Amino acid sequence: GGPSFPEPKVVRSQGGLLSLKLSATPTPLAIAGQRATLLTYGGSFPGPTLRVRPRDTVRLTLENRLPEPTNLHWHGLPISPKVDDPFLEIPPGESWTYEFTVPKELAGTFWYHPHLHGRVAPQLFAGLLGALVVESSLDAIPELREAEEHLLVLKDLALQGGRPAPHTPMDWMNGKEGDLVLVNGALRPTLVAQKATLRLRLLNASNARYYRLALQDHPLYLIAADGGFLEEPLEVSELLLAPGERAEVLVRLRKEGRFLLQALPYDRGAMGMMDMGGMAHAMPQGPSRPETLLYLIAPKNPKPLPLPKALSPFPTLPAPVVTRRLVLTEDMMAARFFINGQVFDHRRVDLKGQAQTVEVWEVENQGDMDHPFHLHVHPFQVLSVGGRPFPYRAWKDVVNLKAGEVARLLVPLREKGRTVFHCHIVEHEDRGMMGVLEVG
Numbered sequence: 001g002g003p004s005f006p007e008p009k010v011v012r013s014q015g016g017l018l019s020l021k022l023s024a025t026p027t028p029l030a031i032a033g034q035r036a037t038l039l040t041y042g043g044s045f046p047g048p049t050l051r052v053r054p055r056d057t058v059r060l061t062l063e064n065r066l067p068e069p070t071n072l073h074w075h076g077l078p079i080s081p082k083v084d085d086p087f088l089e090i091p092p093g094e095s096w097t098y099e100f101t102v103p104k105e106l107a108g109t110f111w112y113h114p115h116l117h118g119r120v121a122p123q124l125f126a127g128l129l130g131a132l133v134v135e136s137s138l139d140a141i142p143e144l145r146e147a148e149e150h151l152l153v154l155k156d157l158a159l160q161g162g163r164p165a166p167h168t169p170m171d172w173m174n175g176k177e178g179d180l181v182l183v184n185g186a187l188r189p190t191l192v193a194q195k196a197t198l199r200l201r202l203l204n205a206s207n208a209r210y211y212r213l214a215l216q217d218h219p220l221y222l223i224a225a226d227g228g229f230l231e232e233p234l235e236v237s238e239l240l241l242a243p244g245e246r247a248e249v250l251v252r253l254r255k256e257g258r259f260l261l262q263a264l265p266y267d268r269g270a271m272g273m274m275d276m277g278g279m280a281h282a283m284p285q286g287p288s289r290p291e292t293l294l295y296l297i298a299p300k301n302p303k304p305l306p307l308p309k310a311l312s313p314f315p316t317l318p319a320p321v322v323t324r325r326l327v328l329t330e331d332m333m334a335a336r337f338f339i340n341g342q343v344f345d346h347r348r349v350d351l352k353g354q355a356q357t358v359e360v361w362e363v364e365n366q367g368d369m370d371h372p373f374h375l376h377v378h379p380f381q382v383l384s385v386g387g388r389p390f391p392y393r394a395w396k397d398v399v400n401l402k403a404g405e406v407a408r409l410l411v412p413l414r415e416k417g418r419t420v421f422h423c424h425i426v427e428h429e430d431r432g433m434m435g436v437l438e439v440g
């Protein structure tokens with residue numbers, strides 16, 4: 001009804017249960033004016049959005065119809081690592097049922113994708129990803145209830161011969177970015193707003209591309225980070241979203257008109273190829289070229305809603321009982337990536353911590369590219385980066401580190417079991433930059 005906007009089909013819980021069979025299968029699709037066979041969940045790119053409420057039961061049966069094994073990571077969900085099992089393999093032709101309960105305090109935007117080590121980057125790049133939304137009682141206050149809500153899945157692509165483009169040697173070093181910069185699987189869609197206040201849930205599901213988001217003539221009001229609400233709205237002129245990160249923003253359209261949502265130039269330290277003999281800046285790739293993500297059309301005579309005065313207070317965290325240091329390094333030409341000097345070994349436990357305690361983690365990027373650090377199972381609070389305070393309080397599960405930056409994270413250890421932490425430039429994860437945490 002009214003103007004259409006491309007957006008994944010939503011599957012909702014009913015009577016406290018979301019039970020769904022989801023097949024991972026090669027799928028011919030229409031895309032950017034052409035036909036391509038992608039790897040998809042549920043026959044769509046992106047996959048379907050699962051929408052639940054706290055205390056719901058999720059029962060998702062993943063049906064592997066791919067030519068290779070796979071698994072699922074429930075990215076950002078603070079559940080058991082015996083469910084969110086990074087070491088599980090589902091062979092081709094087999095199924096596996098993931099069952100869990102949505103925690104009572106959780107809210108925001110999460111996502112699911114493959115996590116079979118060694119094959120994450122080709123599988124995610126081929127199209128295997130979908131969103132998960134946890135509704136909150138806060139969504140009922142008038143300042144959010146009457147906003148026009150949309151999910152925006154930011155994910156680029158490159159095609160060759162009607163299939164996802166193959167990974168090159170440069171791709172394993174830099175991470176793979178595509179030439180088709182898509183929103184919900186569409187090339188530069190147009191959103192004809194019917195309300196003057198929009199609530200946009202944003203997901204960077206790209207392998208490696210960064211999105212320095214800016215809306216023409218408008219600020220963004222950040223109300224949620226990766227894993228939950230902020231304490232109150234935070235006005236920003238632009239918002240950088242690293243791979244794996246999510247955010248929710250309100251947009252207040254004041255004037256009629258058509259406004260571009262753009263991914264402004266950002267230099268994440270990727271490296272170019274060689275030869276040379278010039279006068280200025282080469283060798284690095286330098287900043288991304290600017291991209292138009294979508295066109296936003298404001299409604300007639302727009303009067304936006306007032307902003308909410310407060311959102312969700314952030315929990316007081318106890319004093320930490322241990323401090324950890326995790327140093328990220330790289331060898332670019334070999335395209336190998338390390339944590340404290342070692343590459344991932346699934347038979348090696350790297351950190352041993354205690355359930356029901358809080359730790360400080362100091363994560364130090366001693367490389368030259370941005371690396372976005374992700375910890376499964378245990379959401380954290382970013383204290384500082386580079387010795388300066390983080391700009392808000394909210395649960396995160398991905399923190400971006402530029403060259404030489406050190407992040408101090410407060411990590412409450414929740415569920416027992418064995419889980420992982422890794423760079424979410426998933427090529428780097430495939431090429432070494434992952435370690436194992438065991439909680440007892």
Ligand SMILES: [Cu+2]
Nearest residue numbers: 073075113244
């Ligand atoms: Cu992830």
Ligand SMILES: [Cu+2]
Nearest residue numbers: 371423425428
């Ligand atoms: Cu990395």
